[PDB]
From a paper:
Telomerase is a ribonucleoprotein (RNP), which preserves telomere length by adding telomeric repeats (GGTTAG in humans) to the chromosome 3’ termini. The enzymatic activity of telomerase relies on a telomerase reverse transcriptase (TERT) and an internal RNA template contained in the telomerase RNA (TER or hTR in humans). The human telomerase holoenzyme contains 11 accessory subunits, including histone H2A-H2B dimer, two sets of the H/ACA heterotetramers (dyskerin, NOP10, NHP2 and GAR1) and telomerase Cajal body localization factor, TCAB1 (8, 9). Recent cryo-electron microscopy (cryo-EM) structures revealed the segregation of human telomerase subunits into two lobes flexibly connected by hTR.
However, our cryo-EM structure reveals that dimerization is primarily facilitated by interactions between the two H/ACA RNPs, with the two catalytic cores positioned away from the dimerization interface. In our dimer structure, the two H/ACA RNPs pack against each other through an intricate network of protein-RNA and protein-protein interactions, which rigidifies the RNA linkers in hTR. This limits the relative conformations between the lobes of each protomer. The P4/5 linker of hTR from one protomer binds to a cleft formed by the 5’ dyskerin, 5’ NOP10, and 5’ NHP2 of the other protomer. The P4.2 stem is anchored by residues Lys121 and Arg122 of the 5’ NHP2 and further stabilized by other residues in the 5’ NHP2 (Arg62, Lys65, and Lys69) and NOP10 (Arg34). The junction between the P4.2 and P5 stems (nucleotides 327–330) also engages in backbone interactions with the 5’ dyskerin, specifically with residues Arg158, Arg211, and Arg212. A cluster of previously unaccounted disease mutations in hTR, NOP10, NHP2 and dyskerin is located at the dimerization interface between the 5’ H/ACA proteins and the P4/5 linker of hTR. In particular, NOP10 R34 and dyskerin R158 directly interact with the P4/5 linker. In our dimer structure, we observe clear density corresponding to the two N-terminal RG domains of the two 3’ GAR1, one from each protomer. In our structure, the intertwined N-terminal RG domains of the two 3’ GAR1 make contacts with the P7b stems of the two hTR.
Author numbering:
A (entry chain J), B (entry chain F): 1 to 64
C (entry chain h), D (entry chain H): 65 to 161
E (entry chain G): 43 to 395
F (entry chain C): 23 to 186, 192 to 421
G (entry chain E): 23 to 152
The structure:
Amino acid sequence: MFLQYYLNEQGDRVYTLKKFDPMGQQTCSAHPARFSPDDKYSRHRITIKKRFKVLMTQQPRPVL
Amino acid sequence: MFLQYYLNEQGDRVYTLKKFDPMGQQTCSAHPARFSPDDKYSRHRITIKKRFKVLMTQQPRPVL
Amino acid sequence: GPPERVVLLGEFLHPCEDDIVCKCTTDENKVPYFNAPVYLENKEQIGKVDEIFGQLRDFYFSVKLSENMKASSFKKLQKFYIDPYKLLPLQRFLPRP
Amino acid sequence: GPPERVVLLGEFLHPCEDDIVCKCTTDENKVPYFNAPVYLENKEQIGKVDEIFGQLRDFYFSVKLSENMKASSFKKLQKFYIDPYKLLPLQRFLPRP
Amino acid sequence: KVAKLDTSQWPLLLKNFDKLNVRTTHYTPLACGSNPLKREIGDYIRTGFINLDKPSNPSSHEVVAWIRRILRVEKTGHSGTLDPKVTGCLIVCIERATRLVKSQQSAGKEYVGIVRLHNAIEGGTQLSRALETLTGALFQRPPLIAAVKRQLRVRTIYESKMIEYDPERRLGIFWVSCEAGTYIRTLCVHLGLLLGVGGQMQELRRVRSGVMSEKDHMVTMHDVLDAQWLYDNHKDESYLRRVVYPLEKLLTSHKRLVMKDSAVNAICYGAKIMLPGVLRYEDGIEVNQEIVVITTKGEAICMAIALMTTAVISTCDHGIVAKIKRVIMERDTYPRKWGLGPKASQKKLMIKQ
Amino acid sequence: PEEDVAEIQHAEEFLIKPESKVAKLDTSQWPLLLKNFDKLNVRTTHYTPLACGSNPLKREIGDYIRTGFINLDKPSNPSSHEVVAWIRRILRVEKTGHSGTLDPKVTGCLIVCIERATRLVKSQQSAGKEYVGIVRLHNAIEGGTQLSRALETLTGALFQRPPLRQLRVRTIYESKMIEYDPERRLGIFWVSCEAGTYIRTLCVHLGLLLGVGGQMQELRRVRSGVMSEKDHMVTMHDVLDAQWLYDNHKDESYLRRVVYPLEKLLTSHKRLVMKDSAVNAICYGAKIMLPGVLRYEDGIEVNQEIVVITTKGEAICMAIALMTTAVISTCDHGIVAKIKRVIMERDTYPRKWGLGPKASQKKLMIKQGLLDKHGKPTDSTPATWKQEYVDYSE
Amino acid sequence: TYQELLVNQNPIAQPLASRRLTRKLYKCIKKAVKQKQIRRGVKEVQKFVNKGEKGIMVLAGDTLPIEVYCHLPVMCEDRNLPYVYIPSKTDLGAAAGSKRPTCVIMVKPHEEYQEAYDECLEEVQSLPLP
RNA sequence: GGCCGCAGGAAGAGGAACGGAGCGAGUCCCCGCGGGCGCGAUUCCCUGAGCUGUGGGACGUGCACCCAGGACUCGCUCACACAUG
């Protein structure tokens, strides 16, 4: 849809309409991916998120 | 109105008749602004005091 | 709820079979709505206008009293008050020009 | 029909998409009813109150105009009037003590 | 290594516990509870919530329905409705965390939306001024439902900001901080009336729900499904423990009152919080104020209403510190240890003798 | 490491461990009359708190304004009576008073008390005040040393007369020369003085004493008792704006920076913490008797003005101490203080006198006809009661 | 001197006019003083802006306390009037043809000096928000 | 400060379970919720200037959603707890 964003230097979302940020990188869509409850590709997403070290379990653990 | 002042290093008013400090800058008038009860610019004063972060609520809280 | 203000409707005459008959004394000879709430000057509802009768310029009204009220309570020439919006002008009932 | 009297509701600001936006200036900061008929001081109905918006003590309202009216007709700071019974007090919308 | 950690780095409701006022340091510990982060995965989920990033097609009641199929739980609540096409922060409370839903639903929200204007304006500053006008306590008509005309009501907008404006498409991004139950669709209509050009809310996203935001701990519906799958097929909890968080994370703003292990079960049965069982108490407890009552392991026992201030607790030696509002913890998590104390023993002894 | 801290948080067990060390409080940062609550001498800990009042700072906005004051910086056109009339109108409140009449063209500290804080106006009106004025001399002087010597001479207990009545005595505690301008013949002076000192009259006397003659050009009050111009001072604009912000944005934040609770005026006084049962008795005009004292401050002396407070830190009344600190610590019974001025409203706390052991005993004996209807002895009274019960009416 | 006057400045005194824009504004004021088009002081400027006049409102950035004139910026934004802060109070009064300092003046347009007025107006309209 | 009038009191300061919890029901509050999801066959059609391939539509078909809370009121269960130096 219309809302895009890019991250500033302290990790906050900076919302914008424009497809490119002030440093020339592409802006992400603000909205998450569309979900289906009948999705059967859980194995597949874990498989390659593990491979490229971007699964949520492999990130730095949050400070609570 | 003749009474002026400049702030000390301690934080208190040093009263003076001159229009400049020993350190060069202008002395403020000792007396507060004229007030009239018919004033209907409360919205206006708050609006810009918020913008420049000089509203009384946004300052450091006093010691009680 | 309780109205913002109330205007003089009328004064107490004799009771009649557990409701109260009242002589109407409105400014400009205005006529109340049927089932219009009747208040005392303290803005407490005593009842509702049931009947309206008599001559056009000298008319009476009965008041069907509230659950908690009794017809014995009211004194002679005690005034009653109405929400000014459920009055109507006398001109409405007078004939068309 | 036409009401017995009308009280100052508000003044004309800019039009907006074939209805008229108006700053509300009632005595005691009273708030109009939704779909309350809006009159000019001649007691002629120009429209009805559609939207009510803005801060509690400085609010606006739009007027959905009548069949025969046009939004171009009205001048700046032209006053509009309302039947005083379809106003409400501000205290109703303020929080309970 | 816990000995090296400063008390400011202790998790959840035990954070900065040394800066609470100490009534007494002595009690008898009992091997009953765990730290909320180390609850057995079943209990962890039943006392937990999800900071969800809601997708853009389904209704908010459909989303929490999907969550309760996946996790295989009976109850969920959701911190205020997002309309079907709106995305963003939706705190989904699970099971025993549904006791907190009113506190989450009543919390202050933040939104990032797009208003589309129906004609050209002078520029971005004109839209920025109309937003400043619609700050503070505003009139808003609640929409019609089942042909039931709800009356005009008041809702506060704390702050507003005009982030960007595009004169080509007549689109404007706005950020709004506001009270719960504020209609942002209605705000965009009013913003259009105030400008004179007209307008509609093109798009919306909720960026904050009280304590939780999109900045940290937020997860998508795929993570929820994916984490459950990993637990079902490989018996790995790791992913679920990053999706679900314990309900204590929702209560970190509240003033705390730490209780002895003896008192815990009594309070779960519906006893009033008495002063002899208080170990520690926070500065700034006021009368009739909602406080969280916790164990020495940092578990939330109940939401309580304080009948003594901080200063009053310091002076007294007995009596009702607080009454229960809602009990969070189950009965018999801790054992029954009431009636054993000196004055309570003396009472029972002197009745018998 | 941030990540190392995060790893320990999930791995290792946390517990508020048991200890044998004595529990020591720090009440040095507690607000207003609860500051250093720990340092008060404790008579007893045993009582039943009532949960009726509030901590003064955290009263609801209605009650907060009604029990509060403003350290106002008075503007230079209106009279002092007109200023408090504006504040009464702005805040939508019934009664208002002030800490000393400033003349229309004088500015500075004006402690505007609101509603139930107006019970303190006599104490604030009698408090010592500081001024900064400009004396304009009619003829030239040799130097600023001469004008300083005139101020040195008028330091002390002085004769004074009002402006356009009887001769009056007014002490000026300290006086000082800030600066002098020979061109325009203006001299800034600062004076600390008692209440009701006429500074117009002082400027005339400075003129006569020098020989050149003089008058007051302008004046500003920098202190009014406890409050000063660097202590939470606020303007008429702030008062209007803070009320407006509360009306239109439902935001109390600004009002709570403008208005302060009356307890802030009483922070200098020695404290006597009463039991919650005794509070409403004192509000109805009872004697402050020993059974209801929980805590009492160090260095209370006889005939000293003390503030009597609740356990929540509310001021009940200003009172005159009849017992010393040492006497309160050792005695069995008696009157600790008598009321000077009741601050707190009646029925803030509930009505809980005559429920005690010794009070109930006296009520029983009146019912039995062992004492008279007015609680006085008879011939039939036991010698135990007649000897022990020291009736304070006497 | 212009850079030295930034030390004396007020918390709310933005957008501040540049050294060159300050020079252009003084000369537009002096021309308007000769034709008697300006309005000086808070009392007059507040009255005329409320009454319905339009022009450029020049504010003084050395004014203290701010409560004397801090309502005026929003009075302009309600009616879409351009405003700008210049560095000094004393210079504004000298340019306005006064021997005392002044905190605010409003310059109205005139056929005599539209070229200088247009250079100031367009540059003041172009000023960035703080 | 002093004097007069009216009103409230004529006060010794009590109470180490008071009088609670968890469920269920009825009634209010909350309450913009036919739409959402999947598969099939003529690649099922479609880069529409129509949103849209990170999705839009047609026809078959199935599927799961429309609560959870709070307040009041009348039940059932568990307690009636001052927290063991």
